[PDB]
């Protein structure tokens, strides 16, 4: 649904004001690079989340099933010392997924911000009915969301 | 024919009355001070002062901020943005001449690139703890300040009102510039590092000490934090070598478990001696989160209502530009007086340069809001998960405690609890924020379209109450698949 | 924000209902008072 | 947009081949040991919490005599075009102030006029004027066509603060380009190392041999040698130190440091009973700790600049039980040095144990 | 009461005064010597000053010359008489007041020459005046160039580099007391061929009654090949073995409180990058010496590099040792 959307409104873009479309070629490029690089970390990350929350349910389990172990060989804070350590991996983990989506969320707004410009420029001023300025401002509005 | 400053005619270099009393002379005066930072700057910029007199190796890993740090950036661009207006109004009116009247907008230019420099030579001066040479950066903004305000005492002497576009911008520009003369001041208050006998005793934060803190939002200056610039590395590693758990180190000492555990269960103390007091009240752990985490979450509504407030440019700027590209500008009259305040805004040009800041601009502070709203559900998520495993520490094993099906509550409270809890606090600014757009949006519709746009409100707003309904059927049918 | 609104007011609910349970499990018996005098 | 905000489905996805079977848990993916000289000699520590001595204005005029010529140029050209930008646009503003550009408008619509008695400077009437009076003060060509006149003491200010910058700048720019030409053949280093040090048998006593060279034609006068290895180390009150670098002599017929390099050499440091490395075997020369590092000091005699060159070993790069192949090999009428085999290594019989042993049963 | 004399500060910079000195003559060459070593603040100023009196020396030299000649007069009663009377008698061509002698003089010594102000052809005393202006701007400008390139050649040179612990140790290190203090650098460059020489200033006594006032004698500083030369990367723990000529074996530790001790401590050596030898100083007292404690360690290994942690520099934490002279840890060996 979104690749569709995305298609049919650059491309009424390209028919209501061809001018665009010389355009397009550097947006294009920068979009492909965008494309790879996120798709190349975005994997790992997510390897790294689904990873680090598997341990840190387990040891809840183990402090749970042995609590008088535990509170006999008082090795308390060894246990709390690591509980904490997991945590930290898990919610690093997080961190850095957010971060990343984050990343691509404001390269792709500004690529769609520089598709509103240089659309709008390019319909400013040209010669068409106020119907093909109107499409055209709102579907490359939209191409940005 | 040539291509003159003040404009093709002769009267306009007169200087009989006086310099001051002739406009372009003004503007001259002010287009000086930016070449002048220019050509101050930009020799020491190439230069460099790479000289190793210390040990860098892990100089280059740490760096500093000074005191007024946000407060510089934030005025920076919007004053970018006031020379940006003053550029685009300058051509503007010069196209409705006979002549190019470079007097316009080239001071204007000047500014701009002046502006971004500045900022350029500011931060290159702070990555590198050297404050004596931002003096020069001071004299910069007091000479600006001076050669603005006159221009403004001289519009002020025909009365020209804030009634004329002008005025206006030059006014905002003038207190831009004292508000950045001030703030260098509050920098020379605090550092002391020109007219006073001791220095201050500065050294970067503890976490940038330590090798393994490899997540550097919270080190970084505003524009990086603005558009997770610090990141690329990180993502650009991602081919030469796939990412381990060493590359993404560690945590700074602020957003450790210990630490929020430590400020929860604090909260959670106040509130629980101030309940014991009373006779016969409940713990309540809504506001031991409240009081803990709650100035992120305004911070997050804040720029939230920002984004909201600057997304309805789109509608009007697209009304404005079909409105105007409607008529032929034929049949107008010729007007050689300066355009309008309401003019300004009329234009075909100035909407579209308008439209994309304004996009630019309200994308940034969605994403701010997003990612602090989110690292304070992350931050309270290891809180509570810390207070859990605290209490689970301190449990006793009697029957009458312990049942057949407790590790079975304690695995949900863990794994599912925890997490509908921290995904609620994600979205907990969409509570007080969405009514706000959707309220706007139907005045918008109003205001556009008469009494049917009610109408169109009425319909598209039941798109809430028929999805939670089949949300529901949804996970009633998901929880029986699971099963 | 329509679309989503249905997916905020339900994270609501459940979040009420898990701090509800969160309230519950922190009331609960616990060995000590013993070991607190050192 | 919002992709697992539901979370139900987990705690009780199975461990995986690796997680049960304990496979992944064979980590083997140890850090390196942590080097204190690098092979390229390059020191590389990290110094912490060291108090900033601020910087210098100082600093900035260091970096500028010291740049490369693809820099030095660039400023060079910024320089002087900054600066004739500059007063160019002082001469501009007086002409526009002192009522001159209007002048020379208002007599040259009716040119016959030709009236110029009152003027700050001659024939100075847009910008494109003064940007060439202010070339031509600056560079001190003169051409004469716009003059100086006695009018007006702005203009005579002005003036004199040009000569005065267009000195300066000119006296700066000639004193970093002689700099840079003094500072002609001071290039680089080009002292060769061998990559693997061997430890031979020689004269029934071991040794601890590797190779250096030269490339640059260039003689090193009074060359030095020393020789150090890197260890913790403790005391019998028990001190421990984290790197102690302990100093190993350095083989040579009158105990002296004094290399004289023109052809390769080999330098060898014989094992005896102070030496660091008494007590260790070829089994042991596997993982140890141990780095040895070789510096060689001199002076080039064309420069007369000192030079000191850095090198340091490891347990890995150590070949124990080798030897060095010939290097030099007569030509028909002269001595020639095959740089090809300058590293190449060759086997030969040594006993394995240490010399801690090979001497406590020496007929072995 | 007032502090003990001194020899060498904690900061080098003897404080001795030599007095009664058979003082010599000031000479001239002072005056350049002072002139070509100076700081850019005053550099500039003396820079600036020599061009400004020279071009208004010349100025009122210039005028004076137009003055008696016929020169001013013949300008001034040409603009009554309508008609350029005065062309050709002119002393140099043009100049009629003080502002255009000084405009012309600007023109002749920075080699500018409008050619507003000519060289007439008619007065000899003015082509001397010339010829000498042109002679005495050469030399100023080549002096003023010479200064500049001075600067710029000592101009790499900096301050000191070299860190040295506020105060020493006296442990026991592999079985005998040892003197030791600490020596870091925080230059990024390397001090190529260092050394070091420790020294102990006392007031010695002969058998045959020479009194020396401070005598410096010499220390061996403890080295395993018997060396001075220290590679410093790494800060280093300088040591002294007190062995039976040490003048530090029948010091004890109850009364090293009062006793006239100075070690004065060189460090010489030979920076890299502009090859310019450098010697750093220092001195200990009795005051500064803390018996019984060692120097806490430093460098931590990070699992990918070491790393110094400068912070702790000079701290040093307390141990055991025999509290007593090191005479009488081998005389009585018991102990
Ligand atoms: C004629 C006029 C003349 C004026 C007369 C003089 C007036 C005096 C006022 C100037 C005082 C300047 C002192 C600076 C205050 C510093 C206070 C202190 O530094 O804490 C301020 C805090 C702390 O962050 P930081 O210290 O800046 O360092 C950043 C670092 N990362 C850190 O947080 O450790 O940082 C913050 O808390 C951030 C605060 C941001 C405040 C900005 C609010 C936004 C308003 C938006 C205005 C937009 C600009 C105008 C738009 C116009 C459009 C046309
Ligand atoms: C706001 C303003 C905007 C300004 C925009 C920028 C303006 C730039 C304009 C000019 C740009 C020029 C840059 C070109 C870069 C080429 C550099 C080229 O000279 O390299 C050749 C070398 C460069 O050695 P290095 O890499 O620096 O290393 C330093 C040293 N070798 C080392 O290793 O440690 O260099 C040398 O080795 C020495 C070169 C000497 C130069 C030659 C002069 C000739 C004099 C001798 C007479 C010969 C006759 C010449 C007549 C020619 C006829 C026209
Ligand atoms: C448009 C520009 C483009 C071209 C630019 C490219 C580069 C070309 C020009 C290069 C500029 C010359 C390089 C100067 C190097 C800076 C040295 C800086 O250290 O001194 C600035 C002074 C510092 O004083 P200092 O501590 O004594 O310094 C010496 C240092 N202690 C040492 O090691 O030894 O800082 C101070 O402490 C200030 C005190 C006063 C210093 C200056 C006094 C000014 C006197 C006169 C100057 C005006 C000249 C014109 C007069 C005309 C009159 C009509
Ligand atoms: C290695 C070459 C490097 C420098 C090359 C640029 C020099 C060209 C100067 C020039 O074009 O004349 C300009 C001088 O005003 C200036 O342009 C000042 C020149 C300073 C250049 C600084 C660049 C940074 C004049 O501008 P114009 O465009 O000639 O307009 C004249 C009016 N007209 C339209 C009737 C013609
Ligand atoms: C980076 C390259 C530098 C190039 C700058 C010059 C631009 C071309 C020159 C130009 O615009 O002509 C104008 C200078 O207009 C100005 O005053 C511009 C000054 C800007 C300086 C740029 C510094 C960087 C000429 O203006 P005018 O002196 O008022 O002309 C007199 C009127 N008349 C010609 C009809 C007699
Ligand atoms: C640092 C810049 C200094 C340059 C200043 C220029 C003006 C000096 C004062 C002055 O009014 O000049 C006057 C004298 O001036 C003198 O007589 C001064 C001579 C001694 C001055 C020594 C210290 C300088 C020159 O006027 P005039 O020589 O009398 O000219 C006669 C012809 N006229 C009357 C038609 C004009
Ligand atoms: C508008 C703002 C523009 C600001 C001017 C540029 C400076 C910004 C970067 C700061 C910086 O120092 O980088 C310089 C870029 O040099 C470069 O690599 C580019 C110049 C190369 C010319 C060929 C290096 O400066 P450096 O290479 O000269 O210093 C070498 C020894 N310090
Ligand atoms: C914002 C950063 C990007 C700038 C976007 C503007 C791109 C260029 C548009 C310029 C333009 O065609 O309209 C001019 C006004 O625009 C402006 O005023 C834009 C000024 C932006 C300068 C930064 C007046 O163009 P025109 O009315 O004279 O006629 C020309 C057609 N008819
Ligand atoms: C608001 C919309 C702005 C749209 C353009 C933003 C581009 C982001 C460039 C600025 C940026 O990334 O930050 C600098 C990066 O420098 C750079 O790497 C050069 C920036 C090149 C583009 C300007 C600061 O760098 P830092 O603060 O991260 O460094 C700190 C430790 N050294
Ligand atoms: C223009 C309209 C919006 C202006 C908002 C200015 C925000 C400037 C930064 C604010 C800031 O950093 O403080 C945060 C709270 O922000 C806030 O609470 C901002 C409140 C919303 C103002 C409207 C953190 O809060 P904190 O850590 O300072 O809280 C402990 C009190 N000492
Ligand atoms: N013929 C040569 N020319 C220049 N440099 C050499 C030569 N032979 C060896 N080197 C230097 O020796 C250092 C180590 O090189 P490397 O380990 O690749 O081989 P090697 O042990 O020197 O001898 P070989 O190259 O024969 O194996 C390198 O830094 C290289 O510069
Ligand atoms: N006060 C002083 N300043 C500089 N040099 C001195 C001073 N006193 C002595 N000298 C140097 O010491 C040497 C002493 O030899 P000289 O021939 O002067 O014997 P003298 O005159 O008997 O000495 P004095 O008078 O110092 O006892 C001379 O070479 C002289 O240069
Ligand atoms: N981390 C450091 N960075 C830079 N210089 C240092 C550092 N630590 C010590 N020094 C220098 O070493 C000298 C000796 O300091 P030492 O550690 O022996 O005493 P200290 O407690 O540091 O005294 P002070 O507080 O006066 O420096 C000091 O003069 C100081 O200049
Ligand atoms: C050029 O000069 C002035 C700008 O101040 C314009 O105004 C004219 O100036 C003369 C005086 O010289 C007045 O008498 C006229 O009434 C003014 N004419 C007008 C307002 O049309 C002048 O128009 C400008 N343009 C020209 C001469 O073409
Ligand atoms: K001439």
Redesign the interface.
């Known amino acids: 649904r979104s690749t569709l959307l995305c298609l049919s409104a650059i491309g009424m873009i390209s028919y209501a004001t061809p001018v665009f479309l010389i355009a397009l070629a550097p947006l294009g490029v920068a979009f492909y690079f965008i494309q790879k690089?996120?798709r190349?970390?975005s994997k790992?990350?997510q390897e790294?989340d689904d990873s680090?929350?598997?341990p840190?349910?387990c040891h809840?389990?183990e402090?749970?099933?042995g609590?008088?172990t535990?509170?006999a060989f008082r090795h308390?804070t060894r246990?709390?010392q690591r509980?904490?350590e997991l945590?930290?991996?898990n919610?690093?983990?997080?961190?850095?997924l957010?971060?990343?989506n984050?990343?691509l969320?404001?390269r792709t707004?500004?690529l769609?911000?520089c598709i509103?410009?240089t659309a709008?420029?390019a319909?400013?001023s040209g010669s068409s009915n106020?119907g093909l300025?109107?499409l055209g401002?709102?579907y490359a509005?939209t191409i940005?969301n | 024919m040539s291509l003159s400053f003040c404009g093709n005619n002769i009267s306009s270099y007169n200087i009989y009355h006086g310099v001051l009393q002739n406009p372009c002379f003004v503007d001259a005066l002010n287009l000086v001070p930016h070449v002048f930072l220019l050509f101050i700057t930009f020799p020491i910029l190439f230069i460099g002062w790479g000289s190793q007199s210390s040990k860098v190796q892990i100089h280059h890993n740490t760096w500093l901020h000074f005191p007024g740090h946000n407060l510089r950036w934030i005025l920076t661009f919007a004053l970018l943005f006031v020379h940006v207006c003053e550029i685009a109004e300058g051509i503007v009116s010069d196209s409705q001449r006979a002549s190019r009247h470079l007097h316009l907008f080239m001071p204007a230019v000047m500014g701009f690139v002046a502006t971004t420099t500045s900022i350029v030579y500011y931060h290159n001066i702070e990555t590198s703890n050297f404050p004596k040479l931002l003096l020069a950066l001071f004299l910069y903004w007091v000479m600006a300040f001076i050669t603005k305000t006159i221009k403004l005492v001289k519009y002020w002497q025909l009365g020209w009102g804030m009634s004329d576009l002008r005025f206006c911008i030059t006014g905002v520009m003038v207190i831009l510039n004292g508000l950045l003369m001030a703030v260098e001041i509050n920098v020379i208050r605090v550092r002391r590092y020109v007219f006073f006998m001791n220095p201050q005793k500065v050294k970067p934060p503890e976490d940038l000490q330590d090798l393994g803190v490899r997540?550097l939002?919270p080190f970084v200056n505003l524009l990086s934090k603005a558009?997770?610039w610090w990141?690329?590395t990180?993502?650009?590693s991602?081919?030469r070598k796939?990412?381990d758990?060493k590359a993404?180190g560690?945590?700074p000492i602020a957003?450790?478990?210990?630490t929020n555990y430590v400020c929860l269960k604090e909260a959670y103390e106040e509130q629980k001696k101030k309940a014991a007091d009373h006779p016969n009240r409940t713990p309540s752990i809504w506001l031991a989160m409240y009081r803990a985490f709650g100035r992120p979450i305004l911070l997050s509504s804040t720029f939230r209502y920002l984004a909201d407030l600057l997304g309805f440019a789109?509608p009007l700027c697209?009304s404005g530009?079909?409105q105007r590209?409607?008529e032929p500008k034929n049949n107008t009259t010729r007007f050689s007086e300066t355009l309008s305040s309401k003019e300004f805004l009329e234009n075909?040009?100035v909407l579209?340069?308008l439209?994309?800041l304004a996009?630019?601009l309200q994308?940034?502070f969605l994403?701010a809001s997003?990612?602090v709203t989110?690292?304070t559900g992350?931050?309270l998520?290891?809180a509570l998960?810390?207070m859990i495993?605290?209490k689970?520490?301190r449990?006793s094993?009697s029957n009458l405690s312990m049942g057949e099906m407790t590790?079975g509550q304690?695995?949900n409270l863990?794994?599912i609890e925890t997490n509908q809890l921290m995904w609620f606090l994600f979205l907990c600014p969409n509570l007080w924020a969405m009514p706000v757009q959707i309220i706007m949006g139907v005045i918008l519709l109003y205001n556009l379209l008469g009494s049917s746009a009610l109408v169109g409100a009425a319909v598209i707003v039941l798109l809430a109450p028929i999805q939670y309904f089949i949300a529901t059927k949804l996970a009633e049918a998901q929880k029986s698949t699971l099963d | 924000p329509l679309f989503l609104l249905s997916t905020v007011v339900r994270f609501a609910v459940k979040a009420i209902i898990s701090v509800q349970k969160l309230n519950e499990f922190l009331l609960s018996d616990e060995?000590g008072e013993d070991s607190w005098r050192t | 947009m919002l992709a697992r905000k539901s979370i139900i489905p987990?705690?009780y996805?199975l461990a995986r081949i690796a997680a049960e079977n304990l496979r992944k848990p064979r980590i083997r993916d140890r850090l390196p040991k942590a080097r204190f000289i690098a092979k390229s000699g390059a020191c590389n520590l990290a110094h912490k919490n060291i108090r900033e001595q601020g910087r210098f204005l100082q600093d900035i005029f260091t970096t500028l005599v010291d740049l490369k010529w693809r820099h030095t140029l660039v400023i060079f050209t910024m320089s002087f075009l900054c600066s004739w930008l500059l007063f160019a646009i002082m001469w501009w503003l007086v002409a526009f102030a002192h009522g001159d550009i209007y002048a020379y408008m208002e007599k040259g619509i009716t040119e016959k006029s030709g009236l110029e008695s009152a003027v700050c400077v001659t024939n100075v009437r847009s910008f494109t004027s003064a940007f060439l009076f202010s070339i031509e003060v600056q560079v001190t060509i003169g051409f004469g066509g716009r003059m100086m006149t006695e009018e007006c003491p702005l203009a005579i200010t002005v003036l004199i603060l040009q000569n005065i910058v267009g000195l300066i700048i000119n006296a700066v720019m000639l004193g970093c380009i002689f700099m840079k030409t003094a500072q002609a053949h001071r290039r680089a280093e080009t002292l060769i190392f061998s990559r693997h040090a061997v430890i031979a048998v020689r004269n029934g006593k071991l040794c601890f041999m590797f190779r250096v060279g030269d490339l640059r034609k260039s003689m090193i006068i009074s060359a030095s040698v020393r020789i150090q290895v890197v260890k913790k180390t403790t005391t019998p009150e028990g001190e421990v130190v984290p790197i102690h670098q302990q100093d190993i002599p350095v083989d040579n017929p009158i105990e002296s440091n004094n290399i004289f390099l023109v052809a390769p050499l080999i330098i060898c440091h014989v094992i005896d009973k102070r030496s660091p490395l008494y007590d260790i075997s070829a089994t042991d020369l596997v993982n140890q700790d141990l780095e040895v590092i070789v510096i060689l000091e001199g002076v080039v005699e064309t420069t007369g600049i000192t030079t000191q060159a850095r090198t340091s070993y490891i347990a890995e790069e150590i070949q124990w039980g080798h030897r060095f192949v010939s290097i030099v090999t007569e030509e028909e009428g002269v001595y020639s040095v095959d740089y090809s085999k300058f590293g190449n290594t060759v086997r030969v019989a040594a006993p394995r144990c240490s010399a801690r042993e090979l001497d406590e049963k020496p007929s072995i």
Do not use: C
């Open positions: 690089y996120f190349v970390a790992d990350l790294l680090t929350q598997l840190l349910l809840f389990s402090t749970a099933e609590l008088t535990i509170r308390e246990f709390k509980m904490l945590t930290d991996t919610n690093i983990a997080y961190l850095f957010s971060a990343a984050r990343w969320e404001v707004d500004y769609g911000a509103v410009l709008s420029i319909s400013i106020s300025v109107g401002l709102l509005l940005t | 997540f939002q558009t997770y990141m690329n990180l993502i650009i991602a081919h796939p990412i758990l993404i560690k945590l957003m450790r478990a210990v789109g697209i530009i079909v590209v409607n075909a040009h579209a340069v439209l994309f996009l630019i994308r940034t994403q997003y990612y989110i690292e992350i931050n998520r290891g998960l810390a495993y605290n689970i520490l449990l094993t590790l304690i695995n863990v794994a | 060995i | 987990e705690e996805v």
